[PDB]
């Protein structure tokens, strides 16, 4: 007895779809789902997706409510579709994937990932669910996460954090650290050695190393002195330069965090999705310095220092590829006379 | 178990709601309901009501598919709601009544007409359905139709025609002639003597008496002579006067029918609902004669002749009351020197 | 360079997309596309699909404007997608296929049908377009039409009619008769022997054999006598029985055509798509006889006579399979004492 | 001269409907009302209700702007409709009641509450308005609030707080403490002895007793020691248990307030309306502990202590009914060996 | 190659329209623009204007991204339209002006401001753009801003602050202080001597003089003593009176700022646009004091003191006109016995 009214019954009574029997009366108006409570309509769901309102509602109700990989990781690994779950993209307020497998009769392309239609697609498999490791072994294309070893398969250790109901966190009551595995055209594929972004935000930014603690606490000249960063242009890249009409540098989230605590600024997120590199149209409220495309990455400051200090500074300009969140991020490196002028990640 | 997808299943497989088990995939977009058939969306219902699309869809699917009284009759008798059915108003493409009894969870005010909330409402009961005659005997306010006698109740003979799936017809394979009964505050009413409108349309107008055959076949002066109608202004009232910029008369549907077969004209139906008197903004294509409010009634011509020949003609102008379709219709009667000048029904 | 404004320019100047350079100003509102002509907005396209309005507009403008197979034929042959064209489904006012190849950036899954993603799909190829016969020879799954012989392939002769801009016709100035070929998993199929429906309509029904001329001209008993059809229940199946509240029979379009020219009736097309068998909720205006699901097929009368005269009549009821428009249509055959009682196609 | 343009004139000039004469030009687009100011459109109202945009606008403009009972109190007392005012529900951004009396021609069921249609409805009456106490005495069903005694009527003292323009507050410049009276089927009905919720929110939470001050200030073990709460499971019920994947307890708002000041968490309000018990899908950001249905009530901590300490702890599990905000709230009581395991309110 | 897809390419790649070549696929659904990124739709723009979605998107993408005059200044100077730019109104989330010149083919009334259609309109010209000073000299009606002197033209020094991407700021890395010039019917027009509002907001309010520092820091009686404000009713006008049900005074933003830091309140901005005087429906959360129309102006406190101390206090009531932001603001002045009772700006 699968139906719109049953999905709404579960939302009202269990907070999400829980397979319980029951029905409530529902009204659909434009892109919103309502239910009647004691004679009046109460909004249950406002559709912000490009799917029909009643379909989006069901996929949202059926969203995965355990820690799952952040969407940027799944995108970077080429995931097209999930096996028997919905990965909800809270940055876009929409399903991470257009089609489903065994979830919803309007969006399903199959009931099980073993069906031939799924073979060309990179299917996401969750080893925490019974049977899905074995489905991955039979799939032609897929990405698998597990909490432990899988016999014979060589793992890649994933990021420490995961997404739980749209909250990115490092789990203490739950496990958010997964092993990752990937298959392409029937062959298990070695995942590259990689850095991971830290998935923090401006307001609640917390340092995760003594170097980041020092960066937030010390003055610019003292931090650069203590960590021996002369000639690496941190004044520009990390602290940002607000003296000209065009804003200089400011490409590390921690540097935005330091500035924000002292002086507010505006960030227009003109491509609002989850991605390893984020691009903002930034306007500094105190000075009027601004920049249309300011690429910002949230690396651990120790990792960025490691990355920049390993570069050859003898070329005027080159593109440097660094593996981050399993993808190749291009950095622009500008040097003059053996010193860095700038070093910044580019719009993906 | 009631459900949007089950309603759609019945529409696709049975043509309407038939209580069958099953489900089909449904999409709701732009006030329209779609179902997926072999990978593509097929429109099942476009909402033209002021109700939510999924609610209107369910009421439409649950519409009564037997011959039922035309909505104008039910309105004239003061019907507020129907017992355990939906009277679909095909002139408005919407339910004839705002609420339901035992039909739909979003619109129901009760499951049975015996509930207290129904006592003050005038409930429509259908004697063809088992138990409904006795429900009428117990109800405080109600209208009852039957096909035959009811013990201890005097009937009022209704019109010959009824509505079947939006087609108004005099039934030959099905009975469309009902007895009518009405109760107000527990008291059986004596319904008034009444004429009935004939519910015909322009393009397929069919005469229903020898006088109407003669009207369509004969020239104007031949007809007026044969039925001795000199001095009743039929030339104006029934045939129409297209000689001046304002169109004179033309208040009987048969007169429009006669003109239409020879010469086309435009009728703007600016209040599009079912009613005993209809008002049109008429523009005559041949002459350019037009009129903003032309009230038009489809009485059998013999009945209209009886009415106008039964009036006193000694006063310049007065209001004449005629019970038609059980309601009192006001006509304006204008006379000069003992003859009719015009006689027309008024917008109710 | 593809563009909304360039699509509109072609529609305004060429009647459809013709690859011409230019732009016009465009407004998008209420699922409708407008263009500005001398200071006022003129509607160019109203979206009736479940796609975004600007995407539906582009696919409509790029529709195939040569004679093409009717959508029911393509559906019956399992076609999923078209090579480098859009088959517009005029019954649904929408694209016949969800995805495209080399047509439109929002809906394309590939630029050429040789890409790997197309291998499992049944691709429609048009031998009138240069190169497409050879694309079919290399494709894994496909349907091919041609106007003449293809070296080394046995053809299946298709119907006489095809669809040109939504008009189904037997071409006189253009060829509408195609050879058909089909491949499944790289293997050329032998297409089955099949009847074809005639794709006619009620108001303009034209007989296509002497038997059909006789059916329309002669009275019922004269016709049944002349073609010796006693005992095949044509009175019920083809002519229809309007004597009871439920309408009996009336399963052949020619029988509806004959009734319609004498007496009007209403057909509610409750699944409005192109299909070999059509299902209507029918209400006869003269009698009030009606039926919720009346399955109707337009076979040449001679073909229907051959089919029913080729059945064993010794069992009360059974399912009869008839290949029509390349698909297996199930008919219900009911018999009594060695004669037909009824014989009707089922909702597919 | 009541009209859309006059309602907008009052909104623009007086901040709400004030019965002033005048008109401004208005544009309606989708669900939004605009007015022209110096050549450009300015948004006056965005419709979030299920009513037509222009109707919702008028009811909003006509909202009651004096302190009124919170909607949860009116709901708990069975109020269906208000006499000659609109109680705006700021939690739902919509009218608290679907119909009106003497407010708006699209929603009125009557002009005065004495009309027979209002007799079955529980009408809300405001003794601050001239004549409404006497209307309550004549009403068959109703709820009355006053600021002082009504002769012969036995009062119930209401909550200290009321809602003023969506701000819940205990009035100092205005009176927010009302006497309550209720009638059912013509008979005055004794309102039950009741606790009241405190209607506070997480961010601005202020303690209202020394015990609440101590709870916010002291550590868990010290507070439980000082107020002798051993064996009543406050560690679970009030402080919450974040050590397992499922979040334990956390059912009092003050406990959420204490946690929030130290560590943020996410509350999905999946039924967003005013109610005595609120239910949240909660995710703790620090630990990853979460729970789909966490029922939360804002009682004065002294009241909850009084409630739980009066319970019999000798049964493994029972349902305990407590009157709160005039309604029966069900609590689940789990005990083991004479101590509380948990005690929590259930989803209404 | 100007098109919807090209506008979207620029937004995605450059943060705004930058005249770059390229295209991305775009979906329009209701009032929102999406683009496809790696198989899924990402929202680029939600239309809150009364223009068609695709037009509003292009004007937004083409918005001026240098410091520009606040919209209230342009409105006060009678500006109808801008020369070859779009002034985006971030308070209304819409273009400041309905038509354009050389921006967008759907909204342009001309390509250049020299065209005859522009002569009756007050065109905004930006002396920072090559050629626009000379266009102003040739225009019949216009407003010009420059950073420096224009030969022979007598300047008006504008406000210190300007709007950069919706951020109002006094520029340090950029110039926000302009000279202003205006022409009416071909004649340069002397701009009046004027005060300027300070364009601050409640949360981030920063004092801009020692008097404002003292007002925020000192107690009411001490501030009034130090600055000799006895008899000017500052207790009412600036500090506000919260003792009665109607809120008294509170007409200077700095006084709202002082109250807000101590006790929160609600401001309903019922005409949400940029204007020299703002009007709020205010509800004080601590007391319940409220007022439907509370007019609030953000003058430097020193300027307001200068204004009020120059008034003649010998009349019971008069209207006082003060030039502010180049417009005449009407103040109500009430006096009794040579002292101010109140002095407040009126709804523009
Ligand atoms: O993808 C990009 C392109 C540019 N920039 C910023 O914009 C500046 C100027 O870019 P360009 O004009 O040299 O391309 C760069 O130095 C850098 O700060 C980014 O952050 N990301
Ligand atoms: O309800 C109305 C009012 C007017 N008329 C037509 O309009 C003419 C002029 O009406 P009046 O302008 O004299 O009211 C009438 O003679 C009659 O033909 C109607 O048909 N119905
Ligand atoms: O798919 C169907 C089912 C039924 N019928 C019509 O409805 C009658 C009654 O069907 P049933 O109620 O016996 O299934 C049949 O004899 C036939 O005329 C159809 O045309 N198509
Ligand atoms: O209406 C409900 C149901 C459950 N719970 C919480 O969920 C836990 C587990 O519920 P159940 O799985 O025992 O029903 C309860 O102990 C309680 O913390 C609520 O807060 N409210
Ligand atoms: O445009 C207006 C009108 C009134 N008021 C406030 O409302 C009070 C009462 O206004 P009235 O009822 O005297 O018009 C005024 O003293 C003033 O505080 C304003 O702020 N702005």
From Swiss-Prot, chains A, B, C, D, E:
Residues 64-189 form the AV-Nsp11N/CoV-Nsp15M domain. Residues 3-63 form the Nsp15 N-terminal oligomerization domain. Residues 206-345 form the NendoU domain. Uracil binds at residues 291-295, 342-346. The active site is at residues 236, 251, 291. The record marks 291 as: Transition state stabilizer. Its cofactor is Mn(2+). The record marks 295 as: Uracil recognition site. It catalyses: uridylyl-uridylyl-ribonucleotide-RNA = a 3'-end uridylyl-2',3'-cyclophospho-uridine-RNA + a 5'-end dephospho-ribonucleoside-RNA. It is found in: Host cytoplasm, Host perinuclear region. Likely affects Nsp15 binding to RNA. Homohexamer. Plays a role in viral transcription/replication and prevents the simultaneous activation of host cell dsRNA sensors, such as MDA5/IFIH1, OAS, and PKR. Acts by degrading the 5'-polyuridines generated during replication of the poly(A) region of viral genomic and subgenomic RNAs. Catalyzes a two-step reaction in which a 2'3'-cyclic phosphate (2'3'-cP) is first generated by 2'-O transesterification, which is then hydrolyzed to a 3'-phosphate (3'-P). If not degraded, poly(U) RNA would hybridize with poly(A) RNA tails and activate host dsRNA sensors. This is Uridylate-specific endoribonuclease nsp15. The gene is rep. The chain holds residues 6453 to 6798 of 7096 of the full protein.
């Amino acid at each position: 007895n699968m139906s719109l009214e049953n999905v709404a019954f579960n939302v009202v009574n269990k907070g999400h779809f829980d397979g319980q029997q029951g029905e409530v009366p529902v009204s659909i108006i434009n892109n919103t789902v309502y239910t009647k409570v004691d004679g009046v309509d109460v909004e249950l769901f406002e559709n912000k997706t490009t799917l029909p309102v009643n379909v989006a509602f069901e996929l949202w109700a059926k969203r995965n409510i355990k820690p799952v990989p952040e969407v940027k990781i799944l995108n970077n690994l080429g995931v097209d579709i999930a096996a028997n779950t919905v990965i909800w993209d809270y940055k876009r307020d929409a399903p991470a994937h257009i089609s489903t497998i065994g979830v919803c009769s309007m969006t399903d392309i199959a009931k099980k990932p073993t069906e031939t239609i799924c073979a060309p697609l990179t299917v996401f498999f969750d080893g925490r669910v019974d049977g899905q490791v074995d489905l991955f072994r039979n799939a032609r294309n897929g990405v698998l996460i597990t909490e432990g070893s899988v016999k014979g398969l060589q793992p890649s250790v994933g990021p420490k954090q995961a997404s739980l109901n749209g909250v990115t966190l490092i789990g203490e009551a739950v496990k958010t650290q997964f092993n990752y595995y990937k298959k392409v055209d029937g062959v298990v594929q070695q995942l590259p050695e990689t850095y991971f972004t830290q998935s923090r935000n401006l307001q609640e930014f917390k340092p995760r190393s003594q170097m980041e603690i020092d960066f937030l606490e010390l003055a610019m000249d003292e931090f650069i002195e203590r960590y021996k960063l002369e000639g690496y242009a941190f004044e520009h890249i990390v602290y940002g330069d607000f003296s000209h009409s065009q804003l200089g540098g400011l490409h590390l989230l921690i540097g935005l965090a330091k500035r924000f605590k002292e002086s507010p600024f505006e960030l227009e997120d003109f491509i609002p999705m989850d991605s390893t590199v984020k691009n903002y149209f930034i306007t500094d409220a105190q000075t009027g310095s601004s920049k249309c495309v300011c690429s910002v990455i949230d690396l651990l400051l120790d990792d960025f220092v490691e990355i920049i200090k390993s570069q050859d500074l003898s070329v005027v300009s080159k593109v440097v590829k660094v593996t981050i969140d399993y993808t190749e991020i291009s950095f622009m490196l500008w040097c003059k006379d053996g010193h860095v002028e700038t070093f910044y990640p580019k719009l993906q």
